[PDB]
């Protein structure tokens, strides 16, 4: 029967951890990730605005982008040992 | 500190109270009800007989569908019971007040149980599984206790 | 306190014994705790009180209003005015024949002393005279 007794046979596992996004959604037989479309070059279309804002720029650390803004503020000064190269250029 | 539920002098009285005890509420108040106004040595003697099945606790408020018994005739009713777990606790509690009485310098006799009250403490939650995939409550109902005994003027 | 307006002294007891003690409780406020005692008019299609069957209670209305002369009169025979300053009593100086003063609850002890001293010299009755200042 289709209820409790059929639950006993459910011991196989079709999805594993995706290497691009972490989300335990890589379908091994299809060769595709259901969250991010790996191995396609572009990321997947997200279903709605609510769901996509959960993965935008600024939801993580933004390491490089923050440093760039501080350097731009300072006038891109560079390493002080090498000022002469900068000044010539 | 604790505000006991009535006003009696500190001299000529002895007291105890406990909170959140893990004896069952409804059983405990049927015990307390019958030993009110009784003399302390009589109370301790009576409770010893209940533990041995020689006498019983009569029931009046929490009493539906209870068994009938020849031991209940001593209090003019048919219905009675033997709640061992509550009796052992109350007996210990009363015995300690005789220690306090002796140490305080009253007599070990002429002490009468003037006040005693039981209150409900907050529930402790539990669960049991039922049929058709349901879950139902399975909680526990503890209690709080006060006693004051006084010396008879006689 | 046992004081009376001198213009009504020989009449005040007739007046007092004549006042109604009727109450107009809301319908079924006796049946469920969620309905307060405060009057509301019943508006149901079937309702026995609205339809005025014998045995249901009475409803408020204009017929019960007191005569214009007796209305608002305290049991000592005066009407009341609220005060909170020394400069308030100054208003009563023409009206002290029929009106008396009642100091507002929030005025504190140190200030009340100053109000009562002024009331004595102007000859104005204060009905909360004892108040908090008994100690």
């Amino acid at each position: 029967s289709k209820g409790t007794p059929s639950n006993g046979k459910k011991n196989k596992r079709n999805h594993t951890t995706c290497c691009r996004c972490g989300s335990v959604s890589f379908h091994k037989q299809k060769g595709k990730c259901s969250s991010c479309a790996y191995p396609e070059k572009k990321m997947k279309k997200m279903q709605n605005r609510k769901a996509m804002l959960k993965k935008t720029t600024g939801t993580g650390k933004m390491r490089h982008m923050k440093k760039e803004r501080i350097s731009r503020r300072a006038g891109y000064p560079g390493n002080p040992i090498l000022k002469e190269i900068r000044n010539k250029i | 500190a604790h505000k006991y539920s009535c006003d009696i002098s500190e001299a000529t009285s002895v007291r105890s109270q406990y909170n959140n005890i893990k004896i069952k509420f409804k059983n405990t108040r049927e015990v307390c009800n019958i030993i009110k106004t009784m003399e302390l040595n009589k109370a301790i003697a009576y409770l010893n007989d209940v533990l041995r099945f020689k006498k019983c606790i009569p029931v009046f408020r929490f009493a539906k569908k209870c068994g009938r018994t020849p031991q209940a005739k001593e209090f003019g009713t048919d219905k009675g019971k033997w709640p061992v777990k509550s009796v052992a606790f109350v007996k210990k509690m009363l015995e300690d007040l005789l220690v306090e009485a002796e140490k305080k310098g009253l007599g070990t006799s002429e002490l009468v149980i003037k006040h005693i009250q039981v209150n409900q403490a907050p529930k402790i939650y539990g669960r049991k599984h039922g049929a058709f995939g349901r879950i139902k409550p399975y909680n526990k109902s503890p209690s709080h206790i006060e006693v004051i005994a006084v010396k008879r003027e006689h | 306190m046992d004081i009376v307006n001198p213009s009504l002294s020989k009449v005040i007891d007739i007046i007092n014994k004549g006042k109604s003690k009727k109450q107009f409780k809301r319908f079924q406020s006796w049946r469920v705790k969620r309905v307060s005692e405060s009057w509301r008019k019943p508006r149901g299609i079937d309702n026995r009180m609205r339809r005025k069957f014998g045995g249901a209670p009475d409803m408020p209305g204009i017929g019960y209003k007191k005569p214009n002369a007796i209305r608002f009169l305290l049991p000592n025979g005066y009407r009341k005015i609220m005060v909170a300053c020394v400069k308030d009593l100054e208003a009563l100086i023409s009206l002290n024949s029929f009106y008396c003063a009642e100091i507002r609850h929030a005025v504190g002890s140190k200030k009340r002393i100053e109000i009562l001293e002024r009331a004595e010299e102007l000859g104005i009755l204060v009905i909360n005279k004892e108040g908090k200042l008994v100690k």
Binding site: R13, H15, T16, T17, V24 | - | -
Partner: protein, 51 residues
């Protein structure tokens, strides 16, 4: 079971080090307001999804 991949093992190792209560000295610190670590888990009540 006994057979594991390298990727599965690192997930178990990390899931095992994170599963600890608040150390008893932190509770004495003036600025500290946590009662219990809400990220603690039991194998009887939750799945890791390491698969």
């Amino acid at each position: 079971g006994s057979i594991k991949t390298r990727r599965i093992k690192v997930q178990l190792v990390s899931a095992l080090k994170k599963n600890r209560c608040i150390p008893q000295w932190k509770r004495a610190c003036p600025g500290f307001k946590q009662q219990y670590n809400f990220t603690k888990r039991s194998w009887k009540r939750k799945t890791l999804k390491a698969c």
